[PDB]
Amino acid sequence: MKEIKLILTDIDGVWTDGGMFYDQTGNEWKKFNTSDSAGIFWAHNKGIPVGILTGEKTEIVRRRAEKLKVDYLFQGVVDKLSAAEELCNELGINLEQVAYIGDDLNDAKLLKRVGIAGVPASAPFYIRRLSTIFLEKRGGEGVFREFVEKVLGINLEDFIAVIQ
Amino acid sequence: MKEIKLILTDIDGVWTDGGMFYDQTGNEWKKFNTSDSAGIFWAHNKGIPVGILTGEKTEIVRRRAEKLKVDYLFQGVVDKLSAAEELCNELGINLEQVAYIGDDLNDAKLLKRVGIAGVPASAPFYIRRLSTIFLEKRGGEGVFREFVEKVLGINLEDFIAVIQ
Amino acid sequence: MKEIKLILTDIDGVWTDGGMFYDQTGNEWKKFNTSDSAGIFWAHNKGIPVGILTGEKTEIVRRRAEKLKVDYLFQGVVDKLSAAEELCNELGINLEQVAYIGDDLNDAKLLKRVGIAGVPASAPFYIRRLSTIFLEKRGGEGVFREFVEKVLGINLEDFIAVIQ
Amino acid sequence: MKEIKLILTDIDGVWTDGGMFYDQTGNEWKKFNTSDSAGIFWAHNKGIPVGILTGEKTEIVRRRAEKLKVDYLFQGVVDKLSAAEELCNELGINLEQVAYIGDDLNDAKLLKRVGIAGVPASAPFYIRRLSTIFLEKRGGEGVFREFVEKVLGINLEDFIAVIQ
Ligand SMILES: [Mg+2]
Ligand SMILES: [Mg+2]
Ligand SMILES: [Mg+2]
Ligand SMILES: [Mg+2]
C-alpha cells in the first residue's frame, strides 16, 4: 500500500448505516459499531492520527470522537477537500499521503484527490467507483475498521504481537 | 421518464423500513436514512418540489421534513389520492405530472392514478405490482433516493456536473 | 385452510426481531413494524378478533396494542395455553379454531394445541418444527401480517375489494 | 462436548451486533435479543452458572444482567483472562472446564485458554479462527443462546422434557 500519514473519515454512512433516529422531543441518535474502535486502535498502533470530517454537527459525534480518542474532529464541514488540504498543510503532508473513506456526494471531490480512497459497499454507485481499494462491508458494519486494516496492511503477525 | 413536475412520497416503509420504536413513556422514534436527503437534493437541482403524504402525524416527521426543506407536508391524511388532487389543483398541475412512491394499502389508489408509481422491494406483492418502474431497494435503504434518481434520469454526467 | 375464530399472537420475536433496547436510565424500547397493522386490518375485515399473549409486561406493548385496537391483551402471562383456553371459553370456541403465532419456549405448549400454528423463520429449530404452515418472514419483518394473510386466505380479489 | 462448569460471555458483539446508540444528551443504549435469555435458561436448567466479563461499564448492562439473573457480572474489565482466572479460583474451577464466547481483541487471550472457545460469525477473522466450535449466528442474533445450546448439548430430548 501507499505510505499513509493521516486517515480521515466521514461519519454518516461509514461509521453508521446512514441511520438518523428522531424522537418526538427534538432529540437525535446515531448507532455506532464497537468494531470501528479497532480502526483507531490500529491507526494509533502505527503512529497514524485519525481525523473526522463531517457535514453534520452534533453532540452525538462529539461524544463518540471523545470516547475513541480521535485526533481531529471537524463538524459542519461545507467543503471537505478544503478542510483536508488545510489540515495537510498544518501537518506538513500532502493529499497523496492521506487515506479517506466516505460514502456520498459531499465526499466526492476529496475522494478523487487522496492517496487512498475508500467507499463502503452500501454507497451510491457513482461514489463507489471512486474507491481505489475494494471494501466488502457496508456503512455501520465495521467498514471503518476494514478500511484501516487494509490501508495499514494489518495482518495475523500484527494481531499476534498485540495480544501476547 | 415522463416530464415530472411534482414528486410525492409516503414516509413509513419508504423513508424507513417500517420501524416504529416505542418506549415506556409514550415517546416514539423513526429511523431515517441520510441517503434519502439526496433525493431532495436531486429534485431541487432539477426544479421540482417534493411533498410528503402520510397517514401518521408526528413531530418526528415534521422535524425531518424541516431539516430537508421538503416543500409540502401533509400528515394524518385519510385519503392520499384526494390530497394529491388538491395539491395538484393548488399548484395548478395534473396527477399525470406526478411521481409517487408508497408501500401499503393506503397508497394504492394514488399509485394507480399517477404518471410514475414507485413501490419499494419490501412492500406486499399486491402493492409491489402497482409500481411502474423497478425499484431494487427496501424501505429505509435509500429507496426514496433510488426513486428520484430513476424518475429524473440522474446519470454519471449529472454527477460529474454537481461535484466540480 | 381451517376455519379460524380467533387469532392470537406473541410479541417479542414475532412483532419484533427480539430486540430489547435498554438505556442508562431504566427505560426500554421495542421496534414494531407498521406492516403488521395490516394483520389487524385483515382480521377485523373478516370479523375475527385478535389477542396478544406475552410473558413480558410493558407500557410499550400496552401503547402499541391500543394504537392497533387489538381486541385482547394479556401480559405477564406465564401459562399461555391456559390463557388461550380461558379466552376460548369466553368466546365459546375451541382451540381447533384458534390460529396462534409464537417463536420460543413459552409458546410451545400452545402451538401444539391450536388449529393453525405459525412460527417465524427466525425461531429456534425445535419451535419452528411445530409450525403447521410455512412462514417465510422473520420476527419483526411483517411476519404477523404474513401469518394473518395466510390464515384468512387474503388474496388479490380481497385487495381489489378493499381499495375499491 | 467436554465437561463445562462455567459459561463466561462478553457483551458487545455477542449479546449485541456491536451497536452503540448515542443521543444528544449523554444517554446511551444497547440492543439485546430476547433469544439470548434462553441461553441463561438452559445453563441454569443444567446447573451451570453464567458470568459476564465486559470492558465497558454501563447501567444498561447491569440492569440487563440483573433481569436475566446472571450469576456473575464484571464490568470495566481490562484483562479478561485474569478476571476469569480469579473468578475460577474462587469457584474451584479450571479454565479447561470453562466455555467462553467473545468477538474481539480484548477476548483473544482468554479464548485461547478456555476449554471451549466460541466466536460469533460476525467477528474479525483473526478472532473467529480462535473459535474451537462453529457458531452460525452473528452478534445480536441469539449467538449466546447458540453457544450455550452447543456446549451443553441441548437437544430435542431436552426440549421435549422441559415442556410438560
Ligand atoms: Mg456520509
Ligand atoms: Mg407506508
Ligand atoms: Mg416471543
Ligand atoms: Mg465484544
XYZ file of C-alpha atoms and ligand atoms in Angstrom:
660
model
C 0.000 0.000 0.000
C 0.931 3.673 -0.402
C 2.637 5.326 2.564
C -0.156 6.912 4.624
C 0.405 9.720 7.109
C -3.206 10.554 8.074
C -6.511 8.716 7.976
C -9.630 10.827 7.504
C -13.223 9.627 7.656
C -16.809 10.690 7.137
C -19.368 9.601 9.803
C -22.907 9.012 8.409
C -22.953 6.071 6.028
C -19.460 4.997 7.128
C -19.436 4.713 10.946
C -23.187 4.219 10.662
C -25.575 2.636 8.149
C -26.906 6.118 7.427
C -29.441 5.825 10.228
C -30.720 9.056 11.767
C -33.116 8.399 14.650
C -35.570 11.118 15.581
C -37.943 11.117 18.565
C -40.939 13.343 19.404
C -38.886 15.748 21.566
C -36.169 17.107 19.267
C -33.522 14.581 20.366
C -31.494 12.559 17.818
C -29.468 9.329 17.778
C -26.838 7.587 15.775
C -25.898 3.932 16.011
C -22.124 3.299 16.054
C -20.403 -0.125 15.844
C -17.959 -1.015 18.588
C -15.975 -2.822 15.887
C -14.808 0.527 14.476
C -12.829 1.379 17.628
C -10.225 -1.114 16.409
C -9.740 1.173 13.392
C -8.487 3.851 15.786
C -6.535 1.230 17.746
C -4.643 0.078 14.665
C -4.008 3.602 13.376
C -2.568 4.649 16.740
C -0.558 1.443 16.987
C 1.111 2.520 13.717
C 1.612 6.143 14.804
C -1.069 7.454 12.418
C -3.573 10.123 13.517
C -7.241 9.888 12.506
C -9.495 12.832 11.702
C -13.290 13.062 11.264
C -14.739 15.305 8.560
C -18.486 15.575 8.716
C -21.046 17.930 7.262
C -23.426 17.279 10.164
C -22.761 18.812 13.574
C -23.926 17.004 16.690
C -23.109 16.300 20.333
C -23.576 12.634 19.370
C -20.464 12.752 17.233
C -18.553 14.920 19.745
C -19.128 12.208 22.357
C -18.115 9.370 20.056
C -14.949 11.145 18.871
C -14.047 11.742 22.555
C -14.676 8.147 23.615
C -12.500 6.844 20.741
C -9.709 9.443 21.263
C -9.969 10.533 17.671
C -7.210 13.085 16.968
C -9.132 15.609 14.879
C -12.822 16.417 14.726
C -14.244 18.840 12.166
C -18.037 19.123 12.008
C -20.325 21.326 9.932
C -17.779 20.995 7.155
C -19.036 22.562 3.910
C -16.030 21.742 1.733
C -14.222 18.578 2.806
C -11.436 18.916 0.230
C -10.517 22.371 1.526
C -10.657 21.159 5.148
C -8.411 18.236 4.290
C -5.981 20.447 2.363
C -5.798 22.865 5.279
C -5.098 20.105 7.807
C -2.498 18.616 5.460
C -0.759 21.991 5.273
C -0.747 22.276 9.072
C 0.695 18.763 9.364
C 3.266 19.152 6.568
C 1.942 16.356 4.362
C 0.166 16.132 1.038
C -3.108 14.563 -0.045
C -1.262 11.631 -1.648
C -0.318 10.544 1.925
C -3.946 10.633 3.076
C -6.410 7.731 3.162
C -10.035 8.946 3.183
C -13.274 6.930 3.443
C -16.667 8.493 2.643
C -19.957 7.443 1.045
C -21.719 10.364 -0.627
C -21.829 13.468 -2.808
C -20.089 15.725 -0.238
C -17.152 13.262 -0.169
C -16.541 13.021 -3.903
C -14.049 15.865 -4.521
C -11.898 14.740 -1.620
C -12.100 11.040 -2.592
C -10.727 11.917 -6.023
C -7.653 13.651 -4.602
C -6.444 11.356 -1.779
C -3.685 8.744 -1.952
C -6.117 6.000 -0.961
C -9.894 6.365 -1.314
C -12.330 4.007 0.397
C -16.083 3.815 -0.087
C -18.445 1.393 1.665
C -20.337 -1.231 -0.341
C -23.620 0.466 0.655
C -22.714 3.704 -1.172
C -24.231 5.098 -4.377
C -22.630 3.655 -7.469
C -21.072 6.908 -8.739
C -19.312 7.279 -5.361
C -18.306 3.607 -5.068
C -16.476 3.799 -8.405
C -14.141 6.421 -6.904
C -12.815 3.872 -4.387
C -9.169 2.882 -5.107
C -9.392 -0.281 -2.957
C -12.201 -2.814 -2.628
C -14.217 -2.669 0.626
C -16.594 -5.542 1.326
C -18.532 -4.091 4.260
C -21.454 -1.628 4.312
C -21.668 1.554 6.444
C -22.074 0.691 10.119
C -20.861 -2.916 9.678
C -17.257 -2.168 10.711
C -16.215 -0.721 7.348
C -14.044 1.956 9.049
C -12.149 -0.896 10.712
C -11.972 -2.795 7.413
C -10.618 0.326 5.686
C -7.902 0.967 8.300
C -6.802 -2.675 8.423
C -6.338 -2.710 4.626
C -4.722 0.685 4.387
C -2.199 -0.266 7.068
C -1.638 -3.901 5.997
C -2.699 -5.227 9.413
C -2.041 -8.962 9.322
C -2.030 -12.078 11.533
C 1.506 -11.238 12.766
C 0.278 -7.770 13.920
C -2.569 -9.463 15.752
C -0.306 -11.976 17.497
C 2.012 -9.134 18.510
C -0.709 -7.128 20.266
C -2.439 -9.918 22.239
C 0.677 -11.519 23.678
C -39.101 9.162 -17.906
C -42.125 11.447 -18.373
C -41.871 15.147 -17.585
C -42.461 15.085 -13.828
C -43.490 18.327 -12.109
C -44.058 17.018 -8.597
C -42.589 14.157 -6.561
C -44.773 12.853 -3.734
C -43.783 10.316 -1.103
C -45.106 8.242 1.767
C -42.918 8.012 4.939
C -43.287 4.744 6.893
C -41.942 1.839 4.808
C -40.418 4.211 2.287
C -38.191 6.638 4.184
C -37.995 3.945 6.837
C -38.076 0.145 6.978
C -41.481 0.455 8.695
C -39.805 0.518 12.111
C -41.824 2.245 14.816
C -39.930 2.444 18.106
C -41.922 2.881 21.334
C -40.525 3.453 24.797
C -42.154 3.080 28.192
C -43.155 6.723 28.439
C -45.236 7.468 25.363
C -42.311 8.696 23.235
C -41.798 7.335 19.716
C -38.977 7.194 17.111
C -38.407 6.669 13.425
C -35.115 5.838 11.769
C -34.460 7.810 8.583
C -31.596 7.242 6.184
C -29.227 10.064 5.352
C -29.047 8.703 1.808
C -32.599 9.904 1.103
C -31.677 13.543 1.589
C -30.020 13.212 -1.823
C -33.494 12.585 -3.191
C -34.460 16.106 -2.153
C -31.139 17.437 -3.477
C -31.705 15.931 -6.923
C -35.343 17.058 -7.045
C -34.376 20.625 -6.166
C -31.406 20.669 -8.554
C -33.897 19.893 -11.344
C -36.507 22.465 -10.217
C -39.001 20.019 -8.759
C -40.859 20.353 -5.437
C -41.200 17.322 -3.150
C -44.233 16.657 -0.969
C -44.897 14.164 1.808
C -48.246 12.386 2.255
C -48.526 10.412 5.480
C -51.366 8.691 7.359
C -49.404 9.174 10.576
C -48.890 12.503 12.302
C -45.807 13.111 14.412
C -43.340 15.763 15.440
C -40.751 13.171 14.305
C -41.793 13.712 10.691
C -42.333 17.450 10.989
C -38.742 17.791 12.207
C -37.348 15.625 9.406
C -39.296 17.477 6.700
C -37.984 20.798 8.038
C -34.356 19.599 8.103
C -34.666 18.506 4.471
C -36.578 21.607 3.347
C -39.401 19.500 1.972
C -41.811 21.763 0.087
C -45.107 20.258 1.210
C -46.035 18.134 4.221
C -49.440 16.583 4.830
C -49.928 14.351 7.870
C -52.853 12.401 9.290
C -54.002 12.014 5.698
C -57.019 9.768 5.327
C -57.371 9.921 1.571
C -53.998 10.387 -0.195
C -55.473 10.454 -3.695
C -57.741 13.398 -2.913
C -54.926 15.131 -1.017
C -52.784 14.729 -4.097
C -55.541 16.031 -6.427
C -55.985 19.109 -4.238
C -52.261 19.917 -4.194
C -52.270 19.332 -7.946
C -55.007 21.988 -8.132
C -53.321 24.356 -5.645
C -50.120 24.086 -7.719
C -52.034 24.162 -10.988
C -50.811 20.827 -12.347
C -52.102 17.359 -13.244
C -51.916 13.972 -11.476
C -50.212 12.869 -14.691
C -47.233 15.051 -13.981
C -46.752 13.326 -10.606
C -44.306 10.684 -9.412
C -45.460 8.912 -6.242
C -43.796 6.246 -4.105
C -45.687 4.337 -1.377
C -45.729 0.855 0.139
C -49.123 -0.134 1.520
C -52.923 -0.273 1.344
C -53.411 3.462 1.993
C -51.165 4.250 -1.016
C -52.865 2.003 -3.588
C -55.498 4.329 -5.099
C -52.972 7.139 -5.559
C -50.315 4.856 -7.029
C -52.809 3.862 -9.710
C -53.515 7.459 -10.734
C -50.019 8.918 -11.062
C -47.672 9.191 -14.041
C -44.893 7.213 -12.400
C -45.631 4.911 -9.469
C -42.816 3.542 -7.305
C -43.027 0.871 -4.593
C -40.097 -0.411 -2.513
C -38.935 -4.031 -2.835
C -40.056 -4.580 0.778
C -43.789 -3.937 0.098
C -46.544 -6.604 -0.047
C -46.874 -8.207 -3.500
C -50.253 -6.622 -4.361
C -48.800 -3.129 -3.796
C -45.488 -4.007 -5.483
C -47.193 -4.930 -8.700
C -48.613 -1.382 -8.921
C -45.104 0.014 -9.412
C -44.461 1.167 -12.990
C -40.691 1.048 -12.653
C -38.480 -1.476 -10.871
C -37.015 -0.404 -7.521
C -34.307 -2.631 -6.083
C -34.125 -1.129 -2.587
C -36.199 -1.808 0.528
C -37.862 0.849 2.682
C -35.287 2.780 4.709
C -32.390 1.674 2.459
C -32.395 4.860 0.384
C -35.262 3.739 -1.820
C -36.623 7.318 -1.961
C -33.274 8.371 -3.399
C -33.400 5.446 -5.851
C -36.856 6.509 -6.986
C -35.962 10.153 -7.526
C -32.779 9.267 -9.371
C -34.650 6.910 -11.703
C -37.559 9.320 -12.123
C -35.292 12.220 -13.075
C -32.851 10.037 -15.021
C -29.913 11.207 -12.919
C -26.760 9.884 -14.565
C -22.991 9.972 -14.378
C -22.916 13.272 -16.321
C -25.252 14.874 -13.714
C -22.940 13.578 -11.024
C -19.836 14.990 -12.693
C -21.572 18.350 -13.088
C -22.547 18.779 -9.405
C -19.284 17.797 -7.716
C -16.917 20.137 -9.597
C -57.404 -23.563 5.425
C -59.309 -24.476 8.625
C -61.978 -22.139 9.987
C -60.462 -19.651 12.432
C -62.479 -17.713 15.029
C -59.657 -16.150 16.948
C -56.151 -15.071 16.083
C -53.622 -14.972 18.936
C -50.023 -13.744 18.887
C -46.851 -13.438 20.924
C -44.962 -10.102 20.725
C -41.165 -10.439 21.103
C -39.640 -12.312 18.185
C -42.907 -12.078 16.238
C -43.963 -8.401 16.166
C -40.276 -7.612 16.703
C -36.931 -9.186 15.807
C -36.444 -9.981 19.502
C -34.793 -6.591 20.007
C -34.935 -5.203 23.531
C -33.373 -1.742 23.799
C -32.087 -0.538 27.177
C -30.760 2.907 28.036
C -28.832 4.102 31.122
C -31.965 5.250 32.996
C -34.146 2.133 33.224
C -36.220 2.957 30.153
C -36.822 0.357 27.446
C -37.807 0.198 23.758
C -39.172 -2.226 21.239
C -39.238 -1.787 17.493
C -42.563 -2.672 15.782
C -43.163 -2.814 12.019
C -46.013 -0.734 10.632
C -46.634 -3.584 8.152
C -48.099 -5.738 10.918
C -51.006 -3.320 11.412
C -52.467 -4.777 8.225
C -52.698 -8.094 10.095
C -55.191 -6.493 12.461
C -56.850 -4.813 9.464
C -57.431 -8.090 7.631
C -58.595 -9.876 10.828
C -61.147 -7.192 11.551
C -62.205 -7.096 7.886
C -63.142 -10.781 8.283
C -64.797 -10.187 11.670
C -62.085 -12.058 13.600
C -60.709 -10.762 16.913
C -57.027 -10.743 17.684
C -55.497 -11.195 21.130
C -51.953 -10.657 22.387
C -50.356 -13.179 24.792
C -46.970 -12.117 26.109
C -44.783 -13.156 29.025
C -43.309 -9.658 29.311
C -45.310 -6.745 30.657
C -44.569 -3.286 29.348
C -46.171 0.062 28.704
C -44.515 -0.267 25.321
C -46.826 -3.122 24.345
C -49.822 -1.607 26.134
C -49.479 1.514 23.928
C -48.826 -0.423 20.715
C -51.781 -2.741 21.335
C -54.112 0.167 21.914
C -52.928 2.073 18.879
C -53.752 -1.028 16.781
C -57.119 -1.549 18.530
C -56.230 -5.116 19.430
C -59.169 -6.928 20.960
C -57.458 -8.717 23.869
C -54.179 -8.000 25.604
C -52.708 -10.320 28.233
C -49.221 -9.512 29.560
C -47.034 -11.220 32.150
C -48.688 -14.448 31.054
C -46.840 -17.444 32.459
C -49.090 -20.178 31.073
C -50.070 -19.278 27.516
C -52.048 -22.447 26.885
C -54.252 -21.784 29.963
C -54.761 -18.177 28.897
C -55.876 -19.225 25.408
C -58.235 -21.822 26.794
C -59.842 -19.322 29.167
C -60.238 -16.939 26.232
C -61.794 -19.689 24.114
C -64.328 -20.345 26.893
C -65.294 -16.655 26.976
C -65.941 -16.727 23.223
C -67.491 -20.194 23.184
C -64.898 -21.543 20.781
C -62.362 -24.342 20.911
C -58.569 -24.395 20.388
C -59.025 -26.043 16.981
C -60.486 -22.706 15.788
C -57.534 -20.634 17.016
C -54.522 -19.619 14.945
C -51.512 -18.778 17.147
C -48.069 -17.484 16.191
C -45.136 -17.608 18.627
C -41.367 -18.060 18.402
C -39.958 -19.542 21.601
C -40.142 -21.877 24.625
C -43.106 -20.135 26.365
C -45.128 -20.675 23.184
C -44.618 -24.373 22.503
C -47.431 -25.877 24.570
C -49.991 -23.614 22.961
C -48.539 -24.020 19.430
C -49.036 -27.769 19.817
C -52.740 -27.403 20.598
C -54.133 -24.827 18.133
C -55.811 -25.432 14.757
C -53.096 -23.414 12.959
C -49.657 -22.837 14.466
C -47.297 -20.298 12.878
C -43.622 -19.775 13.807
C -41.406 -17.127 12.210
C -38.363 -18.163 10.137
C -36.121 -16.673 12.757
C -37.199 -19.044 15.551
C -35.214 -21.908 17.161
C -35.362 -25.124 15.178
C -37.306 -27.047 17.811
C -40.041 -24.371 17.825
C -40.149 -23.973 14.037
C -40.949 -27.643 13.586
C -44.224 -27.100 15.488
C -45.464 -24.687 12.807
C -48.275 -26.253 10.756
C -47.935 -23.723 7.917
C -44.744 -22.336 6.354
C -43.895 -18.699 7.135
C -41.165 -17.014 5.093
C -40.674 -13.959 7.279
C -38.563 -13.445 10.379
C -39.657 -11.719 13.536
C -40.131 -8.015 13.069
C -40.277 -8.409 9.249
C -44.070 -8.260 8.910
C -44.470 -11.918 9.845
C -47.606 -11.316 11.863
C -49.131 -9.837 8.657
C -47.871 -12.812 6.640
C -49.500 -15.122 9.201
C -52.901 -13.432 9.177
C -52.933 -13.127 5.382
C -52.198 -16.832 5.032
C -54.599 -17.932 7.738
C -57.536 -15.923 6.285
C -56.763 -16.634 2.623
C -56.282 -12.968 1.819
C -55.909 -12.732 -1.953
C -55.784 -10.216 -4.793
C -59.590 -10.166 -5.019
C -59.749 -9.142 -1.324
C -57.224 -6.432 -2.021
C -59.112 -5.047 -5.017
C -62.302 -5.147 -2.931
C -60.885 -3.081 -0.054
C -59.390 -0.301 -2.152
C -62.437 -0.122 -4.434
C -18.570 -31.943 24.480
C -16.080 -31.674 27.356
C -17.328 -31.117 30.916
C -18.285 -27.448 31.369
C -18.732 -25.970 34.861
C -18.936 -22.288 33.974
C -20.076 -20.277 30.945
C -18.483 -16.838 30.513
C -19.506 -14.221 27.982
C -18.543 -10.851 26.519
C -21.418 -8.429 25.777
C -20.855 -6.035 22.847
C -20.750 -8.006 19.595
C -22.044 -11.225 21.218
C -25.213 -10.180 23.096
C -25.459 -7.304 20.576
C -24.475 -6.662 16.962
C -21.856 -4.216 18.249
C -24.354 -1.340 18.153
C -23.732 1.600 20.480
C -26.556 4.190 20.338
C -25.685 7.748 21.388
C -28.158 10.606 21.727
C -27.648 14.358 22.103
C -27.826 14.360 25.921
C -25.190 11.877 27.065
C -27.520 8.861 27.337
C -26.593 5.519 25.722
C -28.408 2.363 24.500
C -27.697 -1.234 23.649
C -29.989 -3.592 21.792
C -30.281 -7.043 23.338
C -32.039 -10.035 21.777
C -34.708 -11.812 23.795
C -33.455 -15.103 22.299
C -30.331 -14.997 24.449
C -32.383 -15.325 27.633
C -32.760 -18.973 26.703
C -29.010 -19.193 26.986
C -29.390 -18.438 30.690
C -32.444 -20.725 30.943
C -30.528 -23.754 29.611
C -27.377 -23.101 31.692
C -29.444 -22.874 34.836
C -31.506 -25.906 33.852
C -28.261 -27.860 33.685
C -26.978 -26.298 36.927
C -24.218 -24.270 35.249
C -23.597 -20.644 36.307
C -23.074 -17.834 33.759
C -20.729 -14.887 34.112
C -20.356 -11.686 32.086
C -16.903 -10.115 31.509
C -17.051 -6.780 29.722
C -14.539 -3.994 29.051
C -17.399 -1.460 29.048
C -19.208 -0.390 32.166
C -22.849 0.658 31.928
C -26.126 0.642 33.810
C -27.533 -0.751 30.540
C -25.626 -3.994 31.121
C -26.056 -4.046 34.910
C -29.847 -3.903 34.502
C -29.883 -6.493 31.709
C -27.728 -8.898 33.763
C -29.979 -8.410 36.793
C -33.167 -9.072 34.838
C -31.708 -12.290 33.409
C -30.404 -13.383 36.846
C -26.901 -13.772 35.541
C -24.722 -15.284 38.268
C -21.641 -13.036 37.934
C -21.087 -9.626 36.406
C -17.707 -7.952 35.955
C -17.629 -4.645 34.119
C -14.755 -2.337 33.161
C -12.536 -5.430 32.891
C -9.131 -4.646 31.371
C -7.652 -8.140 31.498
C -10.351 -10.762 30.907
C -8.000 -13.735 31.237
C -7.031 -12.508 34.698
C -10.626 -11.795 35.728
C -11.626 -15.277 34.537
C -8.776 -16.904 36.484
C -9.722 -15.078 39.663
C -13.407 -15.946 39.427
C -12.498 -19.540 38.617
C -10.116 -19.686 41.543
C -12.892 -18.657 43.911
C -15.168 -21.355 42.487
C -12.609 -24.168 42.356
C -12.763 -24.262 38.538
C -10.039 -24.982 35.900
C -10.099 -22.920 32.689
C -10.384 -26.186 30.741
C -13.833 -26.576 32.418
C -14.894 -23.092 31.108
C -16.708 -22.141 27.910
C -16.138 -18.545 26.838
C -17.571 -16.540 23.949
C -16.164 -13.224 22.711
C -15.682 -11.371 19.430
C -12.698 -9.034 19.596
C -9.133 -8.167 20.507
C -9.849 -7.951 24.273
C -11.207 -11.542 24.260
C -8.357 -13.269 22.444
C -6.058 -14.173 25.355
C -8.907 -15.770 27.284
C -10.403 -17.519 24.209
C -7.007 -19.178 23.728
C -7.018 -20.681 27.259
C -10.584 -21.973 27.852
C -11.934 -25.471 27.323
C -14.369 -24.360 24.669
C -13.994 -21.078 22.832
C -16.845 -19.551 20.916
C -16.774 -16.638 18.451
C -19.739 -15.134 16.528
C -19.751 -15.316 12.711
C -19.708 -11.508 12.643
C -16.252 -11.246 14.338
C -12.888 -10.286 12.739
C -11.153 -13.284 11.077
C -8.205 -13.382 13.469
C -10.615 -13.786 16.390
C -13.045 -16.161 14.626
C -10.170 -18.532 13.874
C -9.685 -18.968 17.656
C -13.130 -20.489 17.943
C -12.981 -24.248 18.756
C -16.607 -24.858 17.761
C -18.511 -23.484 14.772
C -21.148 -20.801 15.505
C -23.512 -19.819 12.645
C -25.042 -16.776 14.301
C -23.840 -13.183 14.309
C -23.624 -10.928 17.350
C -27.079 -9.847 18.490
C -28.806 -12.656 16.575
C -29.006 -15.047 19.534
C -25.452 -16.333 19.242
C -25.075 -16.538 23.043
C -28.047 -18.956 23.022
C -26.471 -20.859 20.127
C -23.221 -21.126 22.125
C -24.929 -22.335 25.294
C -27.009 -24.928 23.479
C -23.999 -26.272 21.607
C -21.649 -26.530 24.599
C -24.326 -28.143 26.808
C -25.528 -30.440 24.046
C -29.102 -29.162 24.317
C -31.141 -31.421 22.029
C -34.694 -32.355 21.057
C -34.894 -34.677 24.071
C -34.192 -31.761 26.470
C -36.774 -29.660 24.642
C -39.381 -32.443 24.894
C -38.578 -32.937 28.582
C -38.551 -29.248 29.527
C -42.078 -28.538 28.105
C -44.614 -30.627 30.065
Mg -21.705 10.170 4.599
Mg -46.107 3.401 4.204
Mg -41.514 -14.435 21.562
Mg -17.093 -7.663 22.264
